[PDB]
Write a protein that binds this ligand. Structure first.
Ligand SMILES: CCCCCCCCCCCCCCCCCC(=O)OC[C@H](COP(=O)([O-])OCC(O)COP(=O)([O-])OC[C@@H](COC(=O)CCCCCCCCCCCCCCCCC)OC(=O)CCCCCCCCCCCCCCCCC)OC(=O)CCCCCCCCCCCCCCCCC
Ligand SMILES: CCCCCCCCCCCCCCCCCC(=O)OC[C@H](COP(=O)([O-])OCC[N+](C)(C)C)OC(=O)CCCCCCCCCCCCCCCCC
Ligand SMILES: CCCCCCCCCCCCCCCCCC(=O)OC[C@H](COP(=O)([O-])OCC[N+](C)(C)C)OC(=O)CCCCCCCCCCCCCCCCC
Ligand SMILES: CCCCCCCCCCCCCCCCCC(=O)OC[C@H](COP(=O)(O)OCCN)OC(=O)CCCCCCCCCCCCCCCCC
Ligand SMILES: CCCCCCCCCCCCCCCCCC(=O)OC[C@H](COP(=O)(O)OCCN)OC(=O)CCCCCCCCCCCCCCCCC
Ligand SMILES: CCCCCCCCCCCCCCCCCC(=O)OC[C@H](COP(=O)(O)OCCN)OC(=O)CCCCCCCCCCCCCCCCC
Ligand SMILES: CCCCCCCCCCCCCCCCCC(=O)OC[C@H](COP(=O)(O)OCCN)OC(=O)CCCCCCCCCCCCCCCCC
Ligand SMILES: CCCCCCCCCCC1=C(C)C(=O)C(OC)=C(OC)C1=O
Ligand SMILES: CCCCCCCCCCC1=C(C)C(=O)C(OC)=C(OC)C1=O
Ligand code: SF4
Ligand code: SF4
Ligand code: SF4
Lengths: 176, 156, 115, 257, 318, 80, 97, 52, 70, 55
């Protein structure tokens, strides 16, 4: 149930001594290393042509956050604050009140993307599938405050990426 | 005018030579540097873009702050950034370098490297993927492409 | 004459690649960019302190073995003489004396580094 | 390593930091088609270990940088609190997947590589042979995967499914209270240490009955290994101390917390 | 019309250095299962132009503690001695046909070390000091065989004339009677030119950059292009020594094409050794060129003195 | 002697090859028939001018023209 | 000989891009000249290609449009230009275009 | 270059993880463990999971 | 694939073909359509200076044969 | 897997191993990106009787 790595004694007949002396004087293992490197020279490299070719992803992938809607236009977020109660970095800040038809909705739904740890506890804690962490990962900004999303930016992320987020939830939701 | 055309083409030449020869520096801090090594890995391959590491700050062009900036290393970060010759750029990788991240309310963490150095590109993620980091690097190249150095010299 | 012209050309466009390296870009000089590099933290002491050589006996014996290729170097020409067995004996005497010196430097552990 | 990060990204949604293995099991079941791709990876990974070992193990320049470098005696290894390969390079037959086994490591058969000289080179060979044995354990785990659920069915600890959270009342209450307050851990303290690939990685967890930890000390192997760096570096040079810091595989996030 | 001959020598062997940077990065990439540059030009063919423009529009950064005179003189002397070691190389005709061109190559090798050496001293830094005295430890290791190997190979030539070395190898290559000298000279030129496994001066992992760790862009360019001019000149010199080709006095371009492709194959061989080996510790460097190569080099020096006498095959000195 | 020779060929084959090549370079020109021909070629190479002689009357071994049959000849070099 | 087949595949890659002009177009915009089965084209002009004989990562690509939302994207191709319905197919979140 | 004393100053990445764990729940304290040994992620998850 | 290193090498090949080829042509332009005279030894220089003296145009490469004598 | 048999044979000789049998670049042998919808099993406490939580 254990093995001795490097407990080999070399052979001391004249054949193996002459073989190791030819290995020393004529550099056999160095030519082995050169041969393996030359073998990789004649291969197809694994370099995908970004930005035209993309690394493969799954429908579980956790990227940019987005607030989803029902298939009628109504937003899903009913202000229940589980996503900011389970958020391990306190990136989500929610302020709510009954809106003009008496419905439980949010007035403030902020996600600080520069506190966010992209672990997806908010999308698995949301009882109505409102907050999700969608597929976008190419959203680098040139200023810090552009990565402090309010409710408007997250709803626009949902309206932007809904035709993909709905399909990824349709692909994965039986595992959840 | 002719001189505006000449300084426009020379701006295009120097912006081409600076965005197509970015030399980052071997400088990571935390988990993002593993992914930054994956951006150097043969799948995404920074070196096809001219992006290749130089360990010294004197011969580096961009500093990718890849990881968590604590209080104990913030003067080391500032002196490393200071020892880069101009033009030098800063790409902030990951949430801890962007805004403190998962250690934001900590006693020992600088809440974003933009308290220390001027930051050009903020790359979001924990970690951002190597593809997202390469997206941020190509956005930095697009930011260098639209610089107007000699035009603003010609107009001032 | 051609050697001086060639050396002047090489030195000239090696120093005209430096005078267009210092005067062409834009400088922003301040007294932290020109600080000594010590991987981010401030250097402890000077780099003009004594940097103790471990390979010092090999460094001295290099000065006694580098003279040998001021002595063994006429051997392509010394083979062109008409007293040739004497030349061959003296040549093998010189390489043998170099070899006996190297053997003595081995056996007293002179080629090893200190500490 | 990129392909295994694709395996993480498929099973959990993130390439590096998954938050997948949770108290109670794992978060989410394996997606369909994952294990067949793990088989297609593990079928070919041995040739990669072979060509790494071709480039380095019998190479004379690799040996002259690592054979007489960083020798650790056994008693000074136990005294310095070393663990993992740092013990196993020195010949200390100790592996927590054998001696103090956890979840199903007593149900998988593998070997433990034992070094002979305590140097950087035997620790290199121990890490290469642990890659070999990890391929062996992945073969045994792909063959012996059982059907069933992936969380503990104590639904006051692990959350219910979303198909039953939206239908049952108790499952909705348990979802609510586990994602806001969380489960209450009973009072007491444990020290649970596993064989991480760097050595004995421990958690000393102190709970006071609440839903939050009272204390959580993180024992890292790299802390004690980097402590022993100062003995291991004696009589060597800079180009050897870089090999000693290599063979003490340090990740400083666990060294510094 | 000799100044035009000097320019048509030294400007294409700057363009060859420039595209050697691209060949290095791409052959190094395909040996590392990746690609090299292919974005900047059509399959990377304009990447070195971007690197050459970039280093001379970046701020030069003369340091505060640097002794400035030697700090500026070190890359100037680097690129000067890198260019001027190409002039006795027969291509099949050298620029300056020297009767003792081999000793010119050897002495200007010995003077090129002071570029690295004064750069490490003048840039008053600790890593630069380590990179300079590791160049001392490397040069006292390779110079103690670089002259005896090059002596033993010219005992079949008759002189120190590099142009006569074409006439010497008109029948057989001089690697066939002297392949131990050839395989030892090749490692001595690896250790001469600070290339891997004998980097040891610009140590990326021990040091940060070694001697040129303070040199920002512009002066750093004249160490890097100097080093690559040294490796192309050194493979051309190795090719002239051991793989000397057919020379037609009426068709010189045949010899030019032939030694060009041979020296390109040896340049790819340098890139392929740099892509495959760990780096020596710089004492094991010294215990190689003194304890292993030097005894056998003395033995082969005895053999190559006695053997033209032994077979009545002493070559002519004229 | 084969035991010590195999021991030094097992530990230090570089030095065994060194002493073998050096011993051949020592002893082998003393056992070769061609070492005389080296000296004969070197003293048969005309660097200087063959300064002629005033013919006193009795020098029968010295020619009066280079194509005369008396004098030193290099037919041994042409054949070898 | 099979090097002749290699030269024939190179010349039919020159043929498959509409000649030398389109060959140089996809060369200088893509740094990649291999042909592909045209899977689709969105409402912006981004063309989406398969080649299942390539390896996993190279088997699906996009040639971006030259004008998207008023910006000249001839040289400034961008990863964020892909619409979300093609972002599953291109990133291999599904087999289905 | 012979090393006479090594003093590794650490804490340049001391984030104060295990004080932040005290103010967060067990599920919220789980992703701190991914970032300790950030090349051995699910092993740290497994160790924390076995402790809890 | 790997043959994409073959353009750059080829460019480097031309950048090693240009010097030596040129100097051969330069040795055939300054020296009357022939090779450059090699004077390693002072006798060769004496013959070369004799050629420069007997050319009549103060150029060593302009040769004079039996047409110069009667 | 698109390499010529000359380059394939040179590559197999240089590495000393059979490389087309074990390729590190993935092709159509891998799993499909679109999978059928699963039916995940339930645990032992998903019963309607003899399922008192205190037991
Ligand atoms: C050695 C000297 C060079 C000989 C030519 C060579 O090696 O061609 C590659 C050719 C194919 O190599 P491979 O790696 O097996 O490629 C398989 C791919 O499926 C074949 O690749 P593919 O299926 O993608 O085919 C398309 C490919 C076709 O590739 C070519 O046409 C190769 C370039 C030929 C010129 O064309 C391109 O990709 C366009 C390349 C454009 C730039 C080429 C620059 C070449 C240097 C000259 C400047 O190599 C051989 O057939 C073996 C060497 C033959 C040597 C003969 C004696 C000399
Ligand atoms: C050997 C290979 C490399 C050869 C050298 C490179 C080839 C190209 C040479 C010309 C490149 C363009 C000019 C140099 C780069 C200037 C960069 C810069 O910052 O310029 C801003 C500067 C002006 O900067 P500024 O005035 O805006 O100052 C900003 C900085 N503060 C406010 C802090 C002081 O412009 C120049 O210096 C102009 C340089 C000459 C422009 C062209 C003239 C005609 C040439 C034909
Ligand atoms: C110039 C054209 C090409 C030439 C060939 C070179 C191309 C191939 C290069 C491959 C990559 C090498 C990269 C650098 C590697 C550095 C390491 C290295 O080489 O170390 C040297 C190694 C060192 O070996 P080592 O380091 O293992 O030695 C251990 C030493 N002790 C025991 C003291 C610890 O080998 C040598 O030194 C051998 C030198 C060459 C030997 C040539 C001998 C020829 C045969 C002579 C005759 C033999 C029979 C006796 C007489 C019989 C008479 C009848
Ligand atoms: C009086 C009028 C003239 C005034 C003086 C100007 C003289 C000419 C100066 C050089 C040319 C100026 C224009 C420079 C390029 C401007 C256009 C440009 O930037 O095009 C972008 C394009 C690449 O697009 P990109 O976005 O990078 O691609 C993404 C990846 N698909 O880029 C490309 O496709 C490649 C761009 C190549 C740039 C030119 C080639 C390099 C420069 C050569 C000359 C200078 C150096 C000479 C040698 C010095 C020593 C080595
Ligand atoms: C007469 C011929 C000409 C001789 C003079 C010319 C020599 C040319 C080559 C130059 C050599 C110069 C340097 C030689 C040094 C030899 C001394 C030496 O190194 O001894 C030590 C060595 C064992 O090494 P060690 O002490 O353990 O070192 C530890 C670190 N490596 O000890 C050894 O390895 C043992 C060395 C002695 C035994 C060698 C046997 C070789 C036999 C070959 C066949 C016979 C050749 C004819 C010569 C007689 C040999 C007995
Ligand atoms: C402060 C730091 C330094 C800063 C300034 C740096 C300047 C450049 C330094 C590097 C160059 C040093 C040159 C040293 C002299 C080299 C002489 C030489 O090249 O000799 C080789 C060659 C031998 O060939 P030969 O056998 O004579 O053939 C002709 C007869 N048939 O000879 C020939 O072919 C003969 C051709 C004519 C030779 C003329 C005599 C030499 C002129 C020397 C100039 C000054 C050298 C300064 C050295 C500075 C060293 C740092
Ligand atoms: C011994 C041999 C040594 C060889 C050394 C050189 C090797 C490489 C040779 C060149 C290789 C190809 C270079 C391609 C350059 C870019 C071409 C291109 O497409 O540029 C486009 C760019 C932007 O134009 P845009 O208006 O955006 O185009 C929209 C199109 N509908 O527009 C531009 O970039 C503006 C035009 C710039 C043209 C620069 C061309 C390259 C110059 C290289 C310098 C050396 C040339 C050779 C000298 C010696 C031989 C005579
Ligand atoms: C040359 C190949 C790419 C190397 C890129 C290194 C960039 C800096 C990353 C920092 C780093 C270094 C140096 C490093 O060596 C290392 O060890 C594995 C890390 O992880 C703990 C690092 O984070
Ligand atoms: C006209 C002369 C142009 C010289 C250009 C010099 C700058 C190019 C350096 C590229 C480079 C090369 C070749 C290189 O060898 C290298 O090592 C892997 C690098 O990364 C550390 C590089 O950046
Ligand atoms: S992914 Fe995690 S850190 Fe980010 S907002 Fe959601 S719960 Fe918070
Ligand atoms: S958990 Fe969902 S519904 Fe509740 S507050 Fe958060 S996003 Fe809104
Ligand atoms: S942003 Fe997160 S994943 Fe990234 S380095 Fe920081 S702690 Fe690690």
């Amino acid at each position: 149930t254990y093995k001795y790595v490097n407990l080999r004694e070399p052979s001391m007949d004249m054949k193996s001594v002459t073989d190791r002396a030819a290995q020393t004087l004529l550099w056999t293992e160095l030519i082995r290393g050169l041969g393996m490197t030359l073998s990789y020279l004649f291969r197809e490299p694994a370099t995908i042509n970004y930005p035209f070719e993309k690394g493969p992803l799954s429908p579980r992938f956790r990227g940019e956050h987005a607030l989803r809607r029902y298939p009628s236009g109504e937003e899903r977020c009913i202000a229940c604050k589980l996503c900011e109660a389970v958020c391990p970095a306190q990136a989500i800040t929610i302020e709510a009140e009954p809106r003009a038809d008496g419905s439980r909705r949010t007035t403030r739904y902020d996600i600080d993307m520069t506190k966010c740890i992209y672990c997806g506890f908010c999308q698995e804690a949301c009882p109505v599938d409102a907050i999700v962490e969608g597929p976008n990962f190419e959203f680098s900004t040139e200023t810090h405050e552009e990565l402090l999303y309010n409710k408007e930016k997250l709803l626009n992320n949902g309206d932007k990426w809904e035709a993909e987020i709905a399909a990824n939830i349709q692909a994965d939701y039986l595992y959840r | 005018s002719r001189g505006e055309y000449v300084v426009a083409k020379l701006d295009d030449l120097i912006n081409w030579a600076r965005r197509s020869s970015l030399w980052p520096m071997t400088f990571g801090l935390a988990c993002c540097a593993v992914e930054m090594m994956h951006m150097a890995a043969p799948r995404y391959d920074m070196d096809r873009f001219g992006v290749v590491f130089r360990a010294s700050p004197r011969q580096s062009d961009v500093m990718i702050v890849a990881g968590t900036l604590t209080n104990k290393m913030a003067p080391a970060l500032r002196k490393v950034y200071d020892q880069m010759p101009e033009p030098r750029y800063v790409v902030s990788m990951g949430s801890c370098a962007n805004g403190g991240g998962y250690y934001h309310y900590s006693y020992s963490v600088v809440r974003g490297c933009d308290r220390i150095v001027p930051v050009d590109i903020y790359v979001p993620g924990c970690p951002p993927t190597a593809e997202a980091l390469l997206y941020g690097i190509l956005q930095l190249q697009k930011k260098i492409k639209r610089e107007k150095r000699l035009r603003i010299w010609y107009r001032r | 004459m051609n050697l001086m012209i060639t050396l002047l050309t090489n030195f000239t466009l090696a120093t005209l690649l430096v005078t267009i390296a210092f005067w062409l870009p834009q400088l922003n000089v301040y007294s932290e960019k020109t600080s000594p590099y010590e991987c981010g933290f401030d250097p402890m002491g000077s780099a003009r302190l004594p940097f103790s050589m471990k390979f010092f006996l090999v460094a001295i014996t290099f000065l006694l073995f580098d003279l040998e290729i001021a002595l063994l170097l006429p051997l392509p020409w010394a083979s062109q003489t008409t007293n040739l067995n004497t030349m061959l004996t003296m040549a093998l005497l010189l390489i043998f004396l170099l070899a006996v010196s190297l053997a003595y430097e081995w056996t007293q552990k002179g080629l090893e580094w200190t500490e | 390593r990129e392909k295994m990060f694709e395996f993480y990204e498929r099973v959990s949604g993130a390439r590096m930091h998954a938050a997948y293995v949770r108290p109670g099991g794992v978060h989410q079941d394996l997606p369909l088609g994952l294990m067949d791709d793990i088989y297609e990876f593990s079928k070919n990974f041995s040739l990669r270990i072979d060509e790494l070992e071709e480039m380095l193990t019998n190479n004379r320049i690799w040996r002259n940088r690592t054979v007489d470098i960083g020798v650790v005696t056994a008693e000074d290894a136990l005294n310095y609190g070393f663990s993992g390969v740092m013990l196993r390079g020195s010949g200390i037959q100790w592996d927590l997947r054998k001696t103090q086994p956890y979840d199903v490591y007593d149900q998988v058969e593998f070997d433990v590589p034992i070094g002979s000289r305590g140097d950087c080179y035997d620790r290199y060979l121990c890490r290469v042979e642990e890659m070999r044995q990890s391929i062996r354990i992945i073969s045994q785990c792909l063959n012996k995967m059982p059907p069933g659920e992936i969380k503990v069915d104590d639904a006051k600890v692990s959350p219910p499914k979303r198909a039953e959270m939206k239908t049952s009342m108790e499952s909705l209450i348990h979802h609510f209270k586990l994602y806001t307050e969380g489960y209450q851990v009973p009072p007491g303290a444990t020290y649970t240490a596993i064989e991480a690939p760097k050595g004995e990685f421990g958690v000393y967890l102190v709970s006071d009955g609440s839903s939050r930890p009272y204390r959580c000390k993180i024992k890292a192997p790299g802390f004690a290994h980097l402590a022993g760096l100062d003995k291991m570096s004696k009589g060597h040079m800079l180009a050897d101390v870089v090999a000693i810091i290599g063979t003490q595989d340090i990740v400083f996030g666990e060294v510094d917390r | 019309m000799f100044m035009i001959n000097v320019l048509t020598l030294i400007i294409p062997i700057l363009l060859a250095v420039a595209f050697l940077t691209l060949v290095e990065r791409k052959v190094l990439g395909y040996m590392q299962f990746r690609k090299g540059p292919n974005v900047v030009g059509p399959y990377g063919l304009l990447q070195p132009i971007a690197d050459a423009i970039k280093l001379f529009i970046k701020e030069p950064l003369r340091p505060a503690t640097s002794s400035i005179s030697m700090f500026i003189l070190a890359p100037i002397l680097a690129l000067t001695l890198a260019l001027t070691m190409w002039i006795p190389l027969p291509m099949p005709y050298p620029l300056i046909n020297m009767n003792l061109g081999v000793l010119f190559m050897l002495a200007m090798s010995s003077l090129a070390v002071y570029s690295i050496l004064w750069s490490g001293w003048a840039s008053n830094s600790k890593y630069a000091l380590i990179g300079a005295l590791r160049a001392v430890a490397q040069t006292i290791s390779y110079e103690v065989t670089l002259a005896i190997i090059l002596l033993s190979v010219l005992l079949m030539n008759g002189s120190f004339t590099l142009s006569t070395l074409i006439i010497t190898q008109e029948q057989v290559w001089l690697i066939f009677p002297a392949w131990p000298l050839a395989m030892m000279w090749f490692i001595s030129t690896l250790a001469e030119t600070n290339r891997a496994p004998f980097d040891l001066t610009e140590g990326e992992s021990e040091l940060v950059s070694g001697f040129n760790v303070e040199y920002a862009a512009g002066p750093f360019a004249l160490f890097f292009m100097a080093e690559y001019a040294n490796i192309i000149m050194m493979n051309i010199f190795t090719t002239t020594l051991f793989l000397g080709a057919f020379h037609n006095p009426y068709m010189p371009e045949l010899y030019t094409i032939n030694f060009t492709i041979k020296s390109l194959l040896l340049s790819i061989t340098f890139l392929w050794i740099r892509a495959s080996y760990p780096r020596f510790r710089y004492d094991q460097l010294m215990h190689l060129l003194w304890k292993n190569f030097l005894p056998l080099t003395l033995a082969l020096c005895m053999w190559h003195v006695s053997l033209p006498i032994l077979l009545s095959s002493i070559p002519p000195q004229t | 002697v084969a035991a010590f020779l195999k021991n030094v060929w097992a530990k230090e084959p570089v030095l065994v090859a060194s002493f073998a090549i050096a011993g051949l370079a020592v002893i082998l020109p003393t056992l070769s028939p061609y070492t005389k021909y080296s000296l004969m070629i070197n003293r048969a190479t005309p660097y200087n001018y063959p300064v002629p002689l005033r013919d006193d009357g009795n020098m029968p071994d010295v020619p009066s023209h280079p194509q005369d049959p008396q004098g030193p000849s290099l037919e041994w070099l042409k054949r070898l | 000989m099979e090097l002749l087949q290699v030269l024939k595949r190179g010349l039919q890659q020159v043929s498959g891009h509409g000649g030398l002009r389109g060959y140089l177009r996809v060369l200088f915009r893509a740094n990649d000249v291999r042909v592909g089965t045209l899977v689709g084209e969105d409402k912006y002009g981004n063309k989406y290609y398969e080649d299942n004989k390539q390896f996993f990562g190279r088997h699906r690509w996009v040639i971006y449009t030259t004008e998207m939302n008023g910006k000249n994207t001839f040289w400034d191709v961008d990863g964020s230009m892909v619409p979300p319905e093609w972002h599953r197919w291109l990133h291999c979140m599904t087999d289905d275009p | 270059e012979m090393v006479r004393k090594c003093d590794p100053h650490i804490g340049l990445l001391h984030r104060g993880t295990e004080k932040l764990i005290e103010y967060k729940t067990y599920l919220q304290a789980l992703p701190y463990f991914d970032r300790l040994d950030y090349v051995s992620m699910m092993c740290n998850e497994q160790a924390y999971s076995l402790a809890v | 694939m790997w043959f994409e290193v073959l353009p750059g090498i080829a460019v480097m090949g031309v950048c090693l073909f240009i010097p030596g080829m040129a100097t051969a042509r330069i040795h055939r332009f300054s020296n009357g359509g022939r090779e450059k005279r090699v004077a390693h030894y002072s006798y060769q220089w004496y013959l070369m200076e004799r050629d420069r003296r007997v050319s009549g145009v103060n150029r060593y490469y302009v040769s004079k044969g039996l047409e110069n004598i009667d | 897997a698109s390499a010529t048999r000359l380059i394939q044979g040179l590559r197999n000789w240089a590495s000393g191993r059979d490389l087309q049998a074990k390729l590190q670049l993935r092709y159509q042998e891998i799993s499909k990106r679109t999978q059928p919808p699963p039916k995940l099993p339930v645990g032992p406490s998903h019963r309607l009787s003899n399922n008192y939580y205190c037991a």
